[model samples]
Target chain A: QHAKILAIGTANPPNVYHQKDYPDFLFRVTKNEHRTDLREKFDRICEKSRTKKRYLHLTEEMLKANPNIYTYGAPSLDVRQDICNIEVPKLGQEAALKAIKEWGQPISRITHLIFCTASCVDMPGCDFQLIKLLGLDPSVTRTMIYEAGCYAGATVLRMAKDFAENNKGARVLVVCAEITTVFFHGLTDTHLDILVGQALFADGASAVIVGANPEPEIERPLFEIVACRQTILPNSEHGVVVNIREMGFNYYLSGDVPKFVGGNVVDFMTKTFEKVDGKKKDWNSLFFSVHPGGPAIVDQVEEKLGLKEGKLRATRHVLSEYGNMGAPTVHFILDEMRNKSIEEGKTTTGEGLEWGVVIGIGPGLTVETAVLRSESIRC
Target chain B: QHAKILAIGTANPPNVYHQKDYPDFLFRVTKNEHRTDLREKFDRICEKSRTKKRYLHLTEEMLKANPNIYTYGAPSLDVRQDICNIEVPKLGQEAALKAIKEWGQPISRITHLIFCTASCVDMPGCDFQLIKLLGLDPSVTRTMIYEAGCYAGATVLRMAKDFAENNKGARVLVVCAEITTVFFHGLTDTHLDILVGQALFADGASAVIVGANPEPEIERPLFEIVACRQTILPNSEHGVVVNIREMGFNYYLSGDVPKFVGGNVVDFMTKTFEKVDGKKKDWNSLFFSVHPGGPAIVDQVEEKLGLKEGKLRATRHVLSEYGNMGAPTVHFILDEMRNKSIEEGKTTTGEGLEWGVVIGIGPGLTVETAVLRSESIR
Candidate 1:
């Protein structure tokens, strides 16, 4: 409940291609023989997944949810790409390096290295790879976490908070990269599982510079973590499964996962913020950055948590476009809505929002939730 | 430098084929059409890799290292079958459950969960897996560290110590599972890589119960960490690389790695123990449970530290027999030696060793070295 996110940098693959345009390229890659039939199925799947439009079609409305995150125009097209033959660690390493580079903090100030990925492994792994990539000190105590799946970001963020709090003067860097595209299943029946994946998932990585690194030029850090709670449900073992098998990559997603995940946020926030007022209704002033796992998961979480439909528009908008990038989903929501947040004390009418809830559901049938207070908006 | 290792439990895969028996199983798994040619190559590569015998031999030597820890001798067949389709959470869960069942410690007293592994991933991941597996309270703080390789034992052991010292009354349960066969590359000229893997590498997991829990029946904990120092060598990148690639798993071990690993260990030990003594060479009664990385690495470390040859005989015996099992290697070595030292003291001398050094090395070309005092032993 101490570490604040100082800055976050997110990166996706370099090659950009629209979902609509994928059919032509698919035909080109596989030859024109099966083009029409494959396109029909792919389109039907995308429609069902609820990803109406992606990066190439980002209109002004998509940018409206967080008008302040951008400077009155659409962000660059390099934002979304069809990740192919892509290595997740490379994306993760680049995102972390970019954040440290843009933040301009000296390498000496970063003390802990927490590299989180639900996909990929390399050693002199991403942790060591980043030390060189970012030109940071080689001696940074590092831990690379793999296979934590979608919930790894929550776990690692929790760990970062604990690490900083437990060890004095310790700072931590967290990077999350998810490249589900690398394990995409091309068959029709498997396409349903991909629907759950394709809707909310994107190929991207986000790196956050967190700690008490006292750099003079930097503005106030973004949010101060005041409390964290994790709710791990029992007896729902088959809710989520991800593995590599001979016949395409295997993942068994049970329908009950949404039901089990729904009540977690409400319960977590109710109990966590109880320290302040002993009631669930006390957390009214915090900005909400829910990781939109998919449309269904997001809608269910919002309905259960008693959140206004618009409160999580920032998350919904990202999901509607870039899809879920697994571990980085919550951070993308946080990054998108950070600037749009009403400043702590300067309220327009009478009510003001200060703190925010960031939650992620992972493989343990577990919910990763954090309550953070937004101190000020960066220019 | 405070937490103690109280009780330990270990598990390994069933398949334990001998190096001598490899010719029999070589063609079965190797897929080589020329069976005779492959056998000759296996023998020559085994000779070069400095592996006389690997305990995965499906033989009796498996129980010889520490029969107390592992009662059943090594089984015959691929050890992977015993634990392979099991999830990470389940493996760690069963290990923790086993600890409670074997040690008679209730799950309620464990305040922290520390899991170290380079294999397998499960949701809620290992932390939640253990919690749900044991039916422990969800509120118990959890930490999961992956890809730490061999140094995870010392890295995580230091963390457990830091936890006990900082959070008053907090006891930590540390679990290490290494399924090196999962990382094992099939035979090729990569045979050197495969053979080297044979020594000091196996599929096994160890759970150590730690904390200040007191009971009359519990033999006091073995040792408290006296000091721990981690050093990452500069410009020495590419010394050792542990990565997961699509074609097959790969480990890049350069000739300079063994050369780079040993000397810093002695320096770390000297600096760590100087807090206990002003004299530099105050060396009697200290046992060295350095990572049996291989026969050569162990010899180099012993030589650099200026220890008597027999100082690491227990460690040598473990490496010769068990091979290195990734991060669990250090913990396994410590368990066997500490038990032997204890048994030897009880029967022969009735006195305990005072100071010891536990060394573990891994990919960063990083070394995790810890100094321990047996009087501080759990």
Candidate 2:
């Protein structure tokens, strides 16, 4: 029996900042209005960013309270970490509750919990804390995954497949929780990397319940996991990198990331599809649920794969609506795709197709792909 | 087919400070000789610590270079993180090289790598760095596990059993790397928690290659994994607590921990062994490889189970020699048990016993137990 995503749910903080207002707000908050060049540079990036708005847990008042965070090279990782430790689980529980509700079963059946994050870095980690908050069985096997980077949402579904397929009668709840506190920093126009991050990423959490051999009555499989694999782009380890510094994750997003991913998209898809017997050679014949990692990334993969216009609606729309929320970003896409497919009166949840591939990218410049067979029962 | 341990190896830093000399060394280095009462208090704890010696990566010279570590409440986590980032992988490599050498296989054969640590917190983490340092295949699926606490060594082995049994022809290299730098601090007489941590815990690394269906001639299985499970003692969440502080890991290991483990240990073991069909009712019939988390922990478990003397020979010797190396401590016990059992003319590697249990305890007051069947050719 193959493991399938039984249900999905997502949550974002109440605070919303439209992309048009972000540059002005960021510059004003840090008192950098004098640096018009920097502000304008960010403004142009935000304009071209394709993101219409974002939801963030970090509010203006919090930033006002702590200037050390907005100050470059200040010692403030503790403050960032403190926020994440308290907030990551609260957000995760909101999403998890929705997922368990959609699952239409007692929460007691959640035999396993996989809590993934790069945000919440604690010992009796977020996983341990969530067990208490969600009132989960204390004996539930918990795996606390940290620093999964952006590929984790897809990466975790891949990992959960192993657990569900391996253990008999197993049910796994996979939650990816990320907040922008780790990525927030005072901008330096000299370093476009930091600016791109501040302009692009935001906060949110996504959750999914996965298991094999659905109970037939209560368990509803939305998508059947067909095949999953990961590959690191040759010589691209440095293409995207982040390290935990005292100031919270200092990152460098190389401009050539799009080049690396675009150049390798076809090969990754072909290799992933090769495992199953199909004519996946016509890439347009299949639907897509790729990670909206960046606007340029969407354009690159779309152009490189020769996908017809509007084929990447879910990927484009998710990125435009929510920006990039790290590992949890792709699940937002899957949730949106499912909802949109139904609204558009499609047969399958995956844009009226039986087969599609979910793709995710992360810091290793790693590309992960998983083939999905849609099992959506439409309204 | 069941997953089995194919090979095991361990490495410790060159600097070895005997438990007898540690108190004097610690007092002198921290310039705390003025607090003779606290000094004497530590001296007594060291004597009863049931540890004869320990190996540490930090040295007198290194400590002198960084006073922030030896000063209470000093901002020093960055310095500690810096040292671990550079040193964790090197120490892990020493252990992994030895394990790979003993496995009698090409390095390319390693398909999955599970790198565990409560130390070494990085993003392109110690696991990513090890791939570059050890020059393993880039495609090798890597899982970087952090904050596994003390029970992680057994926990990783349990997780690896799933990966190995489910995936055909999978060879998994599991490494536990830790350094004492994350725990080092200046102590105050008022806080016995810091005093106890300094008196116990040291640094070390251990590696094991795991897989199912070992080659008859090339791969010799030391122990076959029978079953594994983890349990959290009720209402014991606060029993062992540690949070990452600006200075380093600020911890509180409750004195009641031994009581918690001892009370529930019998129930934990019975439930675990019940999964496998056997007359495991005779507790003394099986050998033990329990983590000697503390001297009192050893005593509590021994008396609770009514175990015969010498059944815990390996557990005692390991704690006495290495102190507590967190997750890697039990592997040391396993290694010593194999060597000692063979030297004593035992028919099986696990102290001449056909079946045994490997137990580990960690921060959540968690107890993990794994059942093993000795496949030793000796």
Candidate 3:
């Protein structure tokens, strides 16, 4: 009665822009060289941004083709909708293909497909597109999740626990990718949310194969998902919000979100372990897979938890290279964290730790915490 | 090892539009009495709609308040989005109250909520509002489904089976309510799909209390859900589609839909039985809970399966009274079917039949079929 992750594969668009060059890129694209004030503020944000580079599909040339998107409060929902329609599915397919390739099973073996995004709403939805393009079985039981916010990585993993464990020998393919196209819009002035989001948010996709009772040789279990729990910090509902309006899609990340999450993360983790094994756990003793929501997000989590400098090295490294791919950000962390464990010759997949914690925070100020065990048992 | 429906309740808005008076209503509302040819065709469709009246939350006064909504090719998707944000959740709560009331349980007993709508897209979505209004538990695992097309009622049921059966004594509250307010937009030049849908589609919400292994006398099971299956016919994917665009939402219902569904009913039912019991059975033997997609949708199924008239009487009765509430349509039929069986003093709650079939065909041209056992023995 266990749901284990078989494989994980991540993908990003061809265009990669270094973080420091983004201000110049913005200056050239928006043609705002005259506004030296605007350029300076944007440059300052890029400097503070922990990200070294971001892989993006929404290029300057692409922005030039559709001026409606970058214009503030423009009646351009359709333009963004069209972009999400194309990017979210195809880009997700790129990651799914790799995950399937590593999963070492025929495409038909994928019994369920849980296609997730920040927002890609339509009939025959993004799930429809992935199934068609990937040639997945028709009876694959598609579950299309929209607007799950940044916490989506663990959210789908939490959902997969049910799908994989409930059904006998069910294989679930989970895809969480953000286009950042919907997040792209104008900054006529220095609006706090979009400006910060501009420096951090990027396009990327991550896919994972989830199933129970893996075959002996063909299937390899990477992480054994023991328990998944989501607890919302009471009265923190306004911490993060997303509004998809006719003018454009809006994302509001409250400064209070860090306080909300960082304040209660310890309590949440304590409760997670209580249900996990009825025993208290040492915070530094276990590995942490925290989503790099932003600079302060990861910084605050470390400060509150009193984690050592190298405890969240993989998370910071992910943020440095790829920025926050929103929900898919954590996906990159897991893939790299395991790679680090292997390269360093650690005993287990999770940085040589037998027990680890996977954490994600998103809208609803919802905190998704799961206990993942690093297995040393047979294949 | 049983997930059964404890109770079901349905709700509709204050406004009611009679089928016969719709042409007059449409003529006056659009101020298009001058377009008699359009009015005449509208009148003709209303007559053939088999729907005597439609309960609607959207009214003429409401439409006049938002002119951008009714204007053709206008940048008024915001107008519709605003209405959905308000209507979908509140209307759904009204039905959930009644369902919970009938289940004879406290609101806190509800563990998981599967909130479904045709398309109510927002964070802290329809599910968020229902929990706040109903004051349910905070940890109710919420699943928001959008644009599930016409078969939404059973989709959630199919989803609920896992929740109820997998976890011991899991009570899942399923809410599938379509506010036709989203379906409301300009019908200036008599779009075939909108015109047909306008006649049949209306606003309504249906809620059900689904849980496994009842507490004996307290939890009276209405229908014992058994096996659930969905089979999509090859190459029939385009039979129905929905496009939510800037100007307005567009629905395309092809004429080939009836042909596709009708042609495949016999074979699908036979295979359904093959999985159910591995024995061939009479088509007329089981009670039918066919979602009234339209007049021909019910008519086609009967003809293809060679089912008798009274077999789908409850289905026809629901179509006649409330029109097609989209996903909520079947909810109304199930409630009425059980009521009719009880009122008729039938031994079982399914028109005296021991087994019945529930069918819903919607977008993806996908057909959802489920088998239910009608049990009189406690």
Best by DockQ: 2
Residue-pair clashes, model 1: 34
lDDT of 2: 0.85
If ranked by DockQ, best first, what sequence of candidates would result?
Answer: 2, 3, 1
Chain A, candidate 1, TM-score of 0.79
Superposed model 2: Cα runs more than 4 Å off: A278-280, B278-280
For model 1, residues B1-378, the per-residue Cα lDDT tens digits are 356666666666556655565555544544444656656765665554434344332233432332221211122112322233354445455556655555566778777778887764434456665676677767565677766677777888777765565555666788887655345444555435554553336666778777654454653666667556666766677877764433224466776777776656566666666655777754546776767666677777777767775777767766666667667777767767766756765421112566677788887777777777665333
Task: Summarize candidate 2's per-residue lDDT along B1-378 as a digit string, tens digits.
Answer: 899999899999899999888888999999998998888888888888999999999998888999989998788888889999888888999999999999999999998888988886876678777888888877677677888698888888887887788778989998898898878989786667888888899889999999999988889988888888777788888787877777787778888999998898899889889878666667788888888878989888898899999878899999998999988888888889888877888888887788888888887777888888886654
TM-score of 3: 0.95
Instruction: Locate the minimum summed-lDDT window of 10 residues in model 3 chain A.
Output: A370-379
User: TM-scores for chain B, in order?
Assistant: 0.81, 0.98, 0.97
TM-score for chain A in each prediction = 0.79, 0.98, 0.96
Superposed by TM-score, candidate 2 places the C-alpha of residue A4 at a distance from the truth, in angstroms, of 1.1
Instruction: Give the clashing residue pairs of candidate 3, or none.
Output: A118-A147, B118-B147
lDDT of 3 by residue, A206-295 (tens): 999999998988998889888766766789888877777766678777778778877887787887788678645458888878988888
Give the true-structure RMSD of model 2.
1.7
Candidates 1 and 2 compared: the better one by lDDT is 2
